[PDB]
Nucleic acid binder design. Sequence first.
DNA 1: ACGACGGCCAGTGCCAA
DNA 2: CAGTGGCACTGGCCGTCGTT
Lengths: 692, 105
Amino acid sequence: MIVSDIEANALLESVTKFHCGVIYDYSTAEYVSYRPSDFGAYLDALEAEVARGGLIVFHNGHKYDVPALTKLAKLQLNREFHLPRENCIDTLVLSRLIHSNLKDTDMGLLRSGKLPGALEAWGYRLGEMKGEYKDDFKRMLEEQGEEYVDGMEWWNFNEEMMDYNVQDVVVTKALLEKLLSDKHYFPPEIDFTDVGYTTFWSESLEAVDIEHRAAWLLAKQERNGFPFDTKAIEELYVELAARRSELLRKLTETFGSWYQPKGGTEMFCHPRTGKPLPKYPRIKTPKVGGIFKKPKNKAQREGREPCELDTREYVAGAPYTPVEHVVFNPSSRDHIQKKLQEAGWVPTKYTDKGAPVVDDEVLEGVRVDDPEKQAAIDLIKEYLMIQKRIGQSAEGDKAWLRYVAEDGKIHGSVNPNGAVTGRATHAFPNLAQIPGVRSPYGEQCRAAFGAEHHLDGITGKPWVQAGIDASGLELRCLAHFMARFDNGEYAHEILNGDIHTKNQIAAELPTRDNAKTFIYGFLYGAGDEKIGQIVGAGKERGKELKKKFLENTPAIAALRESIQQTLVESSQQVKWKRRWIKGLDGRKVHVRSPHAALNTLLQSAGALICKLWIIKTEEMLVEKGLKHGWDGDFAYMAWVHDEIQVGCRTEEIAQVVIETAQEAMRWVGDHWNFRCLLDTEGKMGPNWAICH
Amino acid sequence: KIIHLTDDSFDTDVLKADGAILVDFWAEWCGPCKMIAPILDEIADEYQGKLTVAKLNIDQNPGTAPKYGIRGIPTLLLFKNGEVAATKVGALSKGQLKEFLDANL
DNA sequence: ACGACGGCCAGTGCCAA
DNA sequence: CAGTGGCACTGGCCGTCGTT
Ligand SMILES: Cc1cn([C@H]2CC[C@@H](COP(=O)(O)OP(=O)(O)OP(=O)(O)O)O2)c(=O)[nH]c1=O
Ligand SMILES: [Mg+2]
Ligand SMILES: [Mg+2]
Ligand SMILES: [Mg+2]
Ligand SMILES: [Mg+2]
């Protein structure tokens, strides 16, 4: 086993030069440094470890180092280099599995201070090395007079870079040994730093293997990227900007501008009493200035000739209130609240901070006498929505248009195990929150992401898309877990026609989607009123649906109680018996709250099932001769919880991807002895609007 | 004796007054504005004949002030033949207003 | 001497699963 | 007591840097 890390000139997207690398070999207990001209030797050493059936440990090597080395070896040495997946270990992947309850800076992409809770020390260190090295580099330049530029610290190799490269390795080594010391994931009877790769995967908890395979597969999906229709989105941006401007014009005509105090420093005091009046706007008492200018002549200084007028504008001692002119901003909840109350509106609900709530619910219910302002409320709702779309598609910091790469794809980032439950998190941009087709502008947004937007490298023909989503996943998970209470009764009922449509009708709800947000909000602990809001009714209607569904399957109560009995010994300050659930693959799953336990249990089950699912799906495809890549037959474009969108070179392949995903899901179900049959629904089409 | 302006009457009451008009831009929530108010009442009298005192509440009438780049209140704009002859910002005292007026009139 | 502006940071809300 | 996430906007606050 060896521990390594490299330093190169840029992020994977445009890296073109290997600067250095360090290797720590457990068999020798020594560190070896490779400088820019030792690149060939560095790669030879990694391959030697592979040839010995050994292991290579990186920190974020799955997403960076490994692919980087493959790319740099090709560019710099014209060498083919491909470390096999089974020989690689990633301490970041391990760290995210074992410390799933914690957050991390995602290797410096996120600000430490903005994250909640604590951060693991070693990993925190590794994530700060880049910014830390940059500070030392800058400090040294300003020490020698030289100026600093953009990011010149990475243009050339230097010994300071080399030293950091060495530190990463000693720190990665320490992190590794810390993770290996966790008895829950690694049996104590085995020295995992002294075994071949097969032993490492077979002797460690199943979760260790799953996490590394998921990260490797997902690293690849990131590189693939999601084919994006830039043109279509820029045209949508124009249309949305026009609508925004029009709404702003109408809203500003209706709600005029006004003045507010701003820039006041001193306290206003009663001229007579002299007592401070903190509630009065802050003021400013000029120090210089009068009606006339100070006398400049002798006689003028005696009252011979009138003094020059002081064009100034202020008079010493004469206080005034500094103000600013403010124009109505439909995006300002504060502005909206101000104008509506000035129109007669009397707020009913306020925030825990005192501000009146101004969301779509209240706006919908606001009633003011003036008919023009009453109508303006709709323009405001539309406006807030238009902004939501513009921000996500064009103007936000993570706007799609700011992320399209040269290859015409958006390479969304994914933290395979970012959520406590074992689900992944998506960001930069978040491809897991694209507006749905049935929401305003949804079809246009959704259609911009699609295989059709990718033209085959050889034939120039657009690729096809295969979208597969697991059927009623978390409800089937529920059936599985309560089977010990109802003997698979629910597990059988659930597959008698669509479960959500069956509930939709029974609950008398408008859409199938509404039935979904209802059942899950209900299943996971929503209160009577929350259930009302979801179904567009009151707390009264909430209690009904609650007792109706809870009465229909009393196993829900039994499952909830058993979970409590297992986690809580006493209880909001809680006394825990155990604070974690045992996931399907053996991992510990932190429970934040007794009340949320059921959600932890089911979301986790669904997450691990889906994770093993996408892994098994790709493997089955590869064993069928299909190659993963734009230069092949298929390409993973996105994984949104229990759904995958795959680009395929041909319809035939798309048909096979859909059927293979179904075989894989059933394999996963059999693999973990699930008490409910698992299924998937697939669709073939040009983009995401049609494939989901 | 003070003229209470509105956005719609500001043009003919001030910009076409053909005489000296002292306009006061104020707001009910300003400390200095409440101070100078009493002073403007007295001034209105004493200067009746050679000066007209007018007040414009920037809250009730938000369209006028912006055109004059109001950045502080109370703002005292002395108009003569449709144009600003002199401007002074602040709760001047009785005497200071007098010096100012007598000097610009 | 003063004020525009870019990070930081809570508040608030809504997008998706 | 829906849970699990990401992220856009406003507005308060402050140290940097160009303007008066
Ligand atoms: C929408 C939504 C979903 N969830 C969880 C629990 C389910 C999974 C997957 O969602 P999906 O819409 O596929 O649901 P699924 O049951 O798979 O329905 P399909 O058969 O995919 O339509 O996400 C939730 O907790 N709250 C929600 O509001
Ligand atoms: Mg590294
Ligand atoms: Mg589903
Ligand atoms: Mg889904
Ligand atoms: Mg959140």
